[PDB]
Fold Aminopeptidase N.
Amino acid sequence: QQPQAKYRHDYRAPDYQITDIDLTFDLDAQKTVVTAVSQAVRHGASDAPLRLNGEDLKLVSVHINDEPWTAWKEEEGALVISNLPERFTLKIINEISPAANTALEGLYQSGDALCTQCEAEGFRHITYYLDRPDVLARFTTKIIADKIKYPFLLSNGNRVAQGELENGRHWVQWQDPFPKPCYLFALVAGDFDVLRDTFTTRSGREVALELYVDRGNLDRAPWAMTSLKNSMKWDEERFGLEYDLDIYMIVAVDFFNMGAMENKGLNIFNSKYVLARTDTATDKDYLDIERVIGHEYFHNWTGNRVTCRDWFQLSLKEGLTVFRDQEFSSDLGSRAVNRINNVRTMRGLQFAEDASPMAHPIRPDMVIEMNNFYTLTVYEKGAEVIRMIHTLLGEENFQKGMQLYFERHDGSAATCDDFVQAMEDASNVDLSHFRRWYSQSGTPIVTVKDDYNPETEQYTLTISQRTPATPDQAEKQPLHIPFAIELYDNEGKVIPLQKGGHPVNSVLNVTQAEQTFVFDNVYFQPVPALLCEFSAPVKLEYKWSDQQLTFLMRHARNDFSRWDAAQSLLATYIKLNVARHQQGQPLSLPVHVADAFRAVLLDEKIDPALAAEILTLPSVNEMAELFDIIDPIAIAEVREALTRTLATELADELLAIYNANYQSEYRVEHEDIAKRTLRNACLRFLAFGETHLADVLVSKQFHEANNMTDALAALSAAVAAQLPCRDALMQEYDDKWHQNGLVMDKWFILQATSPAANVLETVRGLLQHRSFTMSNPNRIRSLIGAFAGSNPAAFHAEDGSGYLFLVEMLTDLNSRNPQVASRLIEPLIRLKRYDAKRQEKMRAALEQLKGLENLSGDLYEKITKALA
Ligand SMILES: [NH3+][C@H]1CCc2c(Br)ccc(-c3ccccc3)c2CC1(O)O
Ligand code: NA
Ligand SMILES: [Zn+2]
């Protein structure tokens, strides 16, 4: 029987608490023996039994105060112990097999090392325990292993004991003084190179930093170490927070499902977010390592010192920590580029999730498998909700709320409501209506109409809002939407906002279904910038003219507004030509639209970081969100045709800007990164010029590149334009990098996203490639996931071959690695967005998976919602 769902309104405090736990591991890959001594305290009724969670455990013994216990019974996923006193010592001994753990949750094998992953509910795969985040205990961990095979034995906290044994075994004991929920426990055993450094806090605490990597990779760790130090200094300056322990350890592992994990004092990272060298890593990799390193470090306060009362409160730490890593990257790098890409993700990927059968509020109300809810909504929309609080309060009040949040809840497990109340009490801003953002799903739609009265010199905005019903909620109500505006006159000068002789704040409080806002002393009919900086996560409906948008592309004060205006301009003609493609007609584009992008290329006063993003066309997933019914083949071909048209009309300007931004020296510095993004944005268009010219330029950049950023941009362009040099370049890349999995991932992504007519045939053949393996999540997502998620034109082939391919892959991964399978099934859940003939084939595919033997709960939850 598949699992029953759990509901947020059923939360009840635990009948039993555990205050301290002493763990002993006798490590072995085939068999590990765990001994756990816990000090327990009963808070519930005297006749309530102790219910411990446990999965795939071989129980060996159960003692209460050293007495072998007889009043216990094992049930599905639990050990139930009865007739207990109010205080006692529980001792459990059980066995596990890390070598058989292909799901990568609990204690498992990563190559030759042993490591753990315990969030959300993985610790119960190690021993019987109260595997819930509102139980906080002080841990002490003793590890015993073969010295030659496992010379390094790591756990949370500080080393407090160590010894050697006979038969070549040794041991180390660790102690972590901060109580924690078990999902923050970590253990690592293996042989590593160690990069060691130090960081001194502003108050004088010296912290030892230790980065563990595979033998031979010390020259790939310096940037990660630098990013850690940068994270520690920034948190002090911006939030006034210092690290609270003596050591900070990071371990890079090749086999990892969840990107990275914030285990107290012992983070475990996917190698993709640690290792970097200029010849193997791109600018995006460097900046991703920075953001992930920061994200995990910032969890030390927003997550660890204050954790979650229950898993429905996940956004309490993830939304706030994402917001923190966004501010970190924005302060240190380009704020405009960070915001633009964060908005592309919201519009392009999160809106669709909110328009799917899996839609949920940032604080879910119902969950079957908690691992299915580490989502764009909980993370990305969660951060937008935090940012809206920052917008309503301001930086000063916002930090006051942070400090009150920590004062009240440091050392406990809190809820989302606790956080909002702290911000409300500290700032004196009423957030009662704002709380609805936590409980209501779906994307609000904000409609705006304006009117200028020359007689009275008044400008009136009539703003309405509505949220369409979602599969999970039939009731929707208006929200508190912060709506930021700016009014520009005929010269591009900002018009002061005022009413009745008093200034009016530029952040409007849109709180009702319909409302009017009147402004005085509007001397000239203005051009509005609406929803500035994406001030709320909503869809905007305003009948722009092409001239208003090109005006904003020229005169808007904030760089984000200039990019946003260009997106609105493109959207109108993306929709035009998709309709034309469906009727067999070629692309049509007014002359004045191409000229607006010509002016961007030739504007010497525009930040090249911004110009590069305006010259980056929306992705196929961003384009899909513009349509009621997705035609993935028309979207893909219209994107190419638009690229070809602009490449021909702007050929001369593109080549000039491309040559002007050449850089002989390669530096990982934001100004250098910006020029390089603008150069490679021009290269995308130039690849679609005359064949002989494009093939020479692309091949030249590939062979002369002194860094992987420029080499991969050329290789990507050769695949995208199907240039004659493609096959040769792709073979050289393979011949050179086939032994480096991280570098080959980029190669698989290009194969899976290729516009070639035989892409599926090539993808299937790559299942036997020397660098691919179904045992590594990174390889799976780079080839299979990129195909189903990032090549919808091929995944949605009219013959249904894409659906059948994915069914085969998921049949394997459902038994091997359900967590990775659940991420790969997401393209099938969106069937209702497509045409009826495609829906029929996709339902048939879901029905096949629905009838699998040993269907995991991960897929059962999604399949059930999809077929409803
Ligand atoms: N608590 C863990 C859960 C694992 C997880 C998943 Br699943 C998906 C995305 C991220 C992540 C998001 C942003 C930056 C870096 C990483 C994480 C890491 C985490 O949130 O620290
Ligand atoms: Na900055
Ligand atoms: Zn996180």
In short: The pocket of sodium ion (ligand 2) is lined by residues 330-331, 333, 335 (CB under 6 Å).
